[PDB]
Each structure stands twice: as structure tokens, then as C-alpha cells.
Design a protein around this ligand. Structure first.
Ligand SMILES: COc1ccc2nc(-c3ccn[nH]3)[nH]c2c1
Length: 281
């Protein structure tokens, strides 16, 4: 089937910078012919080559192409000039989730349940496709116009066949003990995010990267008294040192028992994207 002739930088009115990575920068752009707002990720080839990140960029482009679900940022086009790589991404109008965490303090039982369910529904999909995020954090979970999640940053994503260490606060213990990640890394990360939604802060916190890692392996963290009981139980079934005993993994019989947890008693999994998100306090 004949696809539209490659896009060019000149087809856009580039605007404000939205994000700044080490290898990339994300710019808000408006397609002139169509009036559309894309989040264009700009990567400089020389730097990618120099810093030996070609397989990283390849993987990213390949993984985003494989994704087709409403809780994920979509890839529309890719084009390149003499010095840069451009990725045409979906523009989440309301930005990062961390913005809403920091802005309202911490989430109520209804909000924590709805966004947790959206993240679970998203991971069930991603894992269904045998893809692992490897760096799931509130900085990577964005909010669209509708206030529904849109997961991004697939640079570090890994496609399983039959390495990289993410953000310190969300690193699972096994990553510090064998340098090996699986579906269970993403479930440990989810355990942190939930703790972060209820208590307004990540679970493991310390003066530097070393003390954080020390806390993670020792499993040194504690629930504030003002924490929902049902959410507390869920967080304890996820922040488990034994990677094979995390609620949601294949050893634990997958996503069935996770979605089945009392903290999601009222959640209707089958149509979250169609549901009207609760008002953020
Ligand atoms: C509230 O303003 C913002 C701030 C940062 C943003 N980053 C994206 C984005 C990245 C990839 N897709 N969308 N949209 C944003 C909106």
C-alpha cells in the first residue's frame, strides 16, 4: 500500500522544547498542511554514533512501531536530514504524571485506583507483546488532553527472545544483584508508583545513588499511617525481593490474580479508555 511521501522539517512550525534527554530533545511542532500538533523527538546522528547508541535508537523506533494501544504514545512518521533524526510522536497536552503528584500532593483512593488500573492495563499489553519498559517512572507516564495515561521513552525498552540500569528510585533488587531484567522489573516499578501516588513520594529515598541501592536490597521502606489498607497490601505483593513472587508475573500465574486483587474490586478492566477519568482532587 502506498504510504504518504516522507515528511520534511520544512513541513512544520517548530515551537517550544518540551523535553531534553542526553541523546534527544522533544519539540512541539505544528504540521502546516494539516494544522496538527506533534511532539517531534530530535536525535543528532553524530552524537548517537559517537556515544555508541545506534542499537538503542533502532530498538526505540522498532518498539514504538510495534505498539498499538490507547495507553501508549504513538509513532506517526520518521524522517531525516543530513545531521538529524526526527520521530513524529503523539503530543500529550497535560504533560507528566509527576506534575499532578507534586501539584496536588498525593492522590485519593478513587484517583489512585483509576490511574493504577490504567498502568496495569498498559503493562498487561506491553508484556503480552513480550516487551519490557525497563525504566517505568511518573516522568515517563504522561497525561493526554482527556486525562488518560500515555506511556513514553522506549529507548531503554527490551524485546524478549525465548544490561541497562534505569532510574535509581525504581530499580528492582535483582538488577543490583545479577544485572538482569524481566517483566518483574516493570512490576517492582509499578509497586513504587503506587506508593508514590498514595504517599506523594517514592518508597526508597536517600542522600545519594549508593544509599538508595542499599535501601532497595535491604527492602528498607515503611507506609505512612495515612495509607489505604487495600493499596498497602497490593504494594507489599509487588515490592517483594524474590522476583518470582511478585503479584503479576508468570510464576504467580500472570495478570489474572493482579487484576483480581481487592484494591481493584470495582474496576471494569474491559473499557478503561472509554471511562471518564476522576477529577484530580
Ligand atoms: C504540559 O506540557 C507538556 C510538558 C511536557 C510534555 N511532553 C510531552 C510529550 C512527549 C512525548 N509526547 N508528548 N507533552 C508535554 C506537555
Amino acid at each position: 500500500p502506498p504510504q504518504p511521501r516522507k515528511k520534511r522539517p520544512e513541513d512544520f512550525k517548530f515551537g517550544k522544547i518540551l523535553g531534553e534527554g542526553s541523546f534527544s530533545t522533544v519539540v512541539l511542532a505544528r504540521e502546516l498542511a494539516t494544522s496538527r500538533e506533534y511532539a517531534i523527538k530530535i536525535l543528532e546522528k553524530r552524537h548517537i554514533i559517537k556515544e555508541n547508541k545506534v542499537p538503542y535508537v533502532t530498538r526505540e523506533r522498532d518498539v514504538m512501531s510495534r505498539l498499538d494501544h490507547p495507553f501508549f504514545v504513538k509513532l506517526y512518521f520518521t524522517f531525516q536530514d543530513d545531521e538529524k533524526l526526527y520521530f513524529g510522536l503523539s503530543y500529550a497536552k497535560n504533560g507528566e504524571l509527576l506534575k499532578y503528584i507534586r501539584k496536588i500532593g498525593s492522590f485519593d483512593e478513587t484517583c489512585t485506583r483509576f490511574y493504577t488500573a490504567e498502568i496495569v492495563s498498559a503493562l498487561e499489553y506491553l508484556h503480552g507483546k513480550g516487551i519490557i519498559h525497563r525504566d517505568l517512572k511518573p516522568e515517563n507516564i504522561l497525561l493526554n488532553e482527556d486525562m488518560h495515561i500515555q506511556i513514553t521513552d522506549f529507548g531503554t525498552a527490551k524485546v524478549l527472545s525465548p544490561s541497562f540500569v534505569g532510574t535509581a528510585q525504581y530499580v528492582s533488587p535483582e538488577l543490583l544483584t545479577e544485572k538482569s531484567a524481566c517483566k518483574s522489573s516493570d512490576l517492582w516499578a509499578l509497586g513504587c508508583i503506587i506508593y508514590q501516588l498514595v504517599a506523594g513520594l517514592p518508597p526508597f529515598r536517600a542522600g545519594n545513588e549508593y544509599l538508595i541501592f542499599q535501601k532497595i536490597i535491604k527492602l528498607e521502606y515503611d507506609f505512612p499511617e495515612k495509607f489505604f489498607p487495600k493499596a498497602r497490601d497490593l504494594v507489599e505483593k509487588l515490592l517483594v525481593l524474590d522476583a518470582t513472587k511478585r503479584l503479576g508475573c508468570e510464576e504467580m500465574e500472570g495478570y489474572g490474580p493482579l487484576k483480581a486483587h481487592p484494591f481493584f474490586e470495582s474496576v471494569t478492566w474491559e473499557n478503561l479508555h472509554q471511562q471518564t477519568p476522576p477529577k484530580l482532587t
